[PDB]
Write an enzyme that holds these catalytic residues in place. Structure first.
Site, mmCIF file in Angstrom:
data_model
loop_
_atom_site.group_PDB
_atom_site.id
_atom_site.type_symbol
_atom_site.label_atom_id
_atom_site.label_comp_id
_atom_site.label_asym_id
_atom_site.label_seq_id
_atom_site.Cartn_x
_atom_site.Cartn_y
_atom_site.Cartn_z
ATOM 1 N N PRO A 33 0.850 -1.219 0.000
ATOM 2 C CA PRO A 33 0.000 0.000 0.000
ATOM 3 C C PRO A 33 0.880 1.262 0.000
ATOM 4 C CG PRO A 33 -0.135 -1.143 2.176
ATOM 5 C CD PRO A 33 0.694 -2.044 1.246
ATOM 6 N N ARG A 34 0.280 2.436 -0.135
ATOM 7 C CA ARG A 34 1.077 3.705 -0.191
ATOM 8 C C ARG A 34 1.207 4.308 1.209
ATOM 9 N NH1 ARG A 34 -2.710 7.289 -4.007
ATOM 10 N NH2 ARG A 34 -4.695 6.581 -3.188
ATOM 11 N N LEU A 35 2.231 3.884 1.908
ATOM 12 C CA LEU A 35 2.509 4.388 3.288
ATOM 13 C C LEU A 35 4.033 4.450 3.497
ATOM 14 C CD1 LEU A 35 1.930 1.272 5.542
ATOM 15 C CD2 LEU A 35 2.411 1.345 3.090
#
Length: 122
Positions: A33-35
């Protein structure tokens, strides 16, 4: 029955170390995911202490072999071949968890290690 110590759904819920699973996807294939990374790893340390040294390392196994529930449902066992990350990479990073390379925080053994002890010395 025999060694059923440590409550599951309470203290050690189903699908443990989920942030650690996606953290392998990013640290290995740069996918996930985008983290941020330090944030995911931090989540693994919160789950590492939340999971008491009693039956601690066991959860990792529940992720590879999978666990069953009283309702008759199964969970964990998600360690599979992602797009660009085969079971092989997840197996190489899998270990070194409770060691100083992930979230050791000391285990029941009062040292950096768990399981694989003398080999059934009970």
């Amino acid at each position: 029955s025999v060694g059923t110590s440590c409550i599951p759904g309470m203290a050690i819920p189903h699908n443990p170390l989920d942030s650690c699973r996606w953290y392998v996807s990013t640290r290995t294939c740069g996918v996930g995911p985008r983290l941020a990374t330090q944030e995911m790893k931090a989540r693994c340390c919160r789950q590492l202490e939340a999971i008491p040294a009693y039956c601690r390392c066991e959860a990792v196994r529940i992720l590879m072999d999978g666990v069953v529930t009283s309702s008759g449902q199964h969970e964990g066992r998600l360690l599979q071949d992602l797009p660009g990350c085969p079971r092989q990479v997840q197996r190489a990073f899998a270990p070194k968890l409770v060691t100083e390379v992930e979230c050791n925080l000391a285990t029941i053994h009062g040292g950096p290690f768990c399981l694989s002890l003398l080999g059934a010395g009970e």
